[PDB]
Subunit: 186 residues, 2 copies
């Protein structure tokens, strides 16, 4: 039940609730498919270099080349329910149900991990200055530095289920399950 | 790193806020209402909806805010807080509305019917899928309308309501 994406070459990609992750053409013929251990919930993200990245309920984030060949796999504790985010330097950001935020080098290795108390259910957002913002189900909004360390965490009551938004003045706005909207300064 | 302000609503906020060209912040609540809040934290207006707003609201180039609802309607809201028009679907709308090149508003529905709505709110056409549609539609370069996994069969919908292929 995910949204599909279109490539810089016009290809249509989508994850399927019946396990596979088809890569279709505009005419409808199957170009190739790539099956994962479980159904795919996240919508795929196409990197600047054309690499297609997508999460999976099997706990792995996969990197697939335009030609269908696997570039690498990255193991996380639990399923990935949110689309990954690519930064300017190409670093892929992703969160898992195990409560960690991961920064994966485009070559397939881990750069750093950062833990939150509960699962991370939504994609992180990278600020204009490179700061990575992400919500945790532990009720806090985390601001994580490019170096993998914490800059600050902001407490809410209930879980944060959705990605924050950055205004022109840099203010971070995010909805909480506790009923409040918050606006946080850098 | 500090709190600038907080604005209390009745129920949980499931979806992300959206910001307009003038800095206005719009955010849906599970208490039914759509809240419009200023950069200074004050309430500009709120719109009344029957059950809940599930997905994030979207704004067209015309400045009109479009939002789905768990009560089954799709709403067009005027920047002044009044209703521009509404549109009824059979079941709740889970997906955020999508606005194309020509201003047509697209949205899924838990009634299994992909809708396209003219800028003025009149129905352009409906297309029936098998099961509920939860994914937001996507539009390609050539205007092709794409729809989510209604029942494990992705659809490619033509601009004129007809179909290209299923999957």
């Amino acid at each position: 039940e995910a949204s599909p994406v279109i490539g810089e070459d016009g290809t249509i990609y989508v994850g399927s609730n019946d396990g596979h992750l088809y890569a279709i053409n505009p005419d409808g013929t199957e170009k190739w498919r790539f099956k994962t251990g479980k159904a795919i919930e996240a919508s795929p993200v196409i990197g600047e270099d054309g690499t297609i990245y997508v999460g999976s309920n099997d706990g792995h984030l996969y990197a697939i080349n335009p030609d269908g060949t696997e570039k690498w796999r990255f193991k996380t504790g639990k399923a990935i329910e949110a689309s990954p985010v690519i930064g300017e330097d190409g670093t892929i950001y992703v969160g898992s149900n195990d409560g960690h935020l991961y920064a994966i080098n485009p070559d397939g290795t881990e750069k750093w991990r950062f833990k939150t108390g509960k699962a991370i259910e939504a994609s992180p957002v990278i600020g204009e200055d490179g700061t990575i913002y992400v919500g945790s189900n532990d009720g806090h909004l985390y601001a994580i530095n490019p170096d993998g360390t914490e800059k600050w965490r902001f407490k809410t009551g209930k879980a944060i289920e959705a990605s924050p938004v950055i205004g022109e003045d840099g203010t971070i706005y995010v909805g909480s399950n506790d009923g409040h909207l918050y606006a946080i300064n850098p």
